[model samples]
Target: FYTAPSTESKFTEVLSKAKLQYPTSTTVAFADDLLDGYAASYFYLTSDLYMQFQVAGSSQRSELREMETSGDEAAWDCTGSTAHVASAQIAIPVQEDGIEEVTILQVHDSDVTPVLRISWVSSITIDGVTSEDVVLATIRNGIDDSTATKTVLQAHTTSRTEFNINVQNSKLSITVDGTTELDEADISQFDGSTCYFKAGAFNNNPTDTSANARIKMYELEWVDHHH
Candidate 1:
């Protein structure tokens, strides 16, 4: 079931109008009855970049389970060094059939630096089961590497970057900004079909600190076209 946004109540009224019960903090369930003969589902969420979500059985969910800081100083250190601003995750209920497309819409501010990244992992199994996960598209802001503050502005000269990934036969074909075909990779060996959104900075060492970054998100959409 789908619910539209309202002014009086953020998400509560929508749920109430739909007669769907909200899950407890750690519990995850369908907002309504599953559609007969349709195993596919779609979800949409909007939030400021400062918030993070936790999946039921993931290690990252356990690590950053609570809000420790707030406002400008709010951050969590995924690498235990600088600090990660915010993140969210939605664990789709396993479909006996399959999955198809996922889309995300986001915006960035001048405070963010090094350019934010979106990461994903799909088709994972915990005990010998298999699933398919795919990343359909990503929208990113252009960063000025030479400057202290890498800001993405509407009028300023910036590289508007986008990626569209088509997955077939365990391989992912990537297209940049809807035009140039960039690179392809065989990531079939990976465990789960999970994707991530990494922001602030990039590093190979995995131990360095990337500081002072902020990113905002308006929507995240997941669509399973397969039956």
Candidate 2:
């Protein structure tokens, strides 16, 4: 069961209860300091809840509206099973030209390379034709990008989509909008790493002062299984 966004104070209060961290330029910002509608906000219309996020394209620093898991308890072994489920809509295109990209969700390690990243790539050329796609990239080489292979799924529009990313014994799978996109994919290279969950807008194009990104998260949750 959920309640409406009755007041600004209550909105931030609920965010605090979730035990997630938000990024800022100087230091980590508290939920109360994030009441501005530009970077972050929340809404509950009818029966649905939506967490809104936005980042400026022209920012020198990577503008982010990401909510990251906090504390030691939030991090889990890659050997154990873990899952991240999120329902979100990308309103602003991360990239309309060139090779711009933005992360929507990630399985990241402490001071190490990310184990898995779900991104919206600007354009992927196939047979001389270019198109955008959602990329579920996994890394085998921790210190290098050479092993960051991914499964490309067609992105239809800037519409709400539900994602279920599951990892068990270093094997990864992804389901989008009730459709199984990738199943039991090999991610055994990261078996020994520890990872935590992250969601919301993480714009990678820092220099493109003209490229802004907006995302609306309808729902987000995760579970770490010891078995």
lDDT value for candidate 1? 0.24
Off by over 4 Å in 2: 1-27, 30-49, 57-73, 81-99, 125-130, 133-140, 144-146
Candidate lDDT scores, in order, read 0.24, 0.52
Q: For each candidate in turn, give its C-alpha RMSD to the true structure in angstroms.
A: 19.2, 5.8
Q: Model 1: how far is 19 from its true place, Å?
A: 21
| TM-score of each candidate structure, all chains considered together | 0.27, 0.68
Itemize residue pairs with steric clashes in candidate 2.
57-211, 58-209
Tens digit of lDDT per residue, candidate 2, span 9-111? 4345334323323333332443333433223232222234455555555322222223433422345666565443333333434444333666677767644
Residue-level lDDT of model 1, residues 54-115, one tens digit each, is 22211111111111112122222212222222222222222112112111221122244322
Steric collisions counted per model: 20, 2
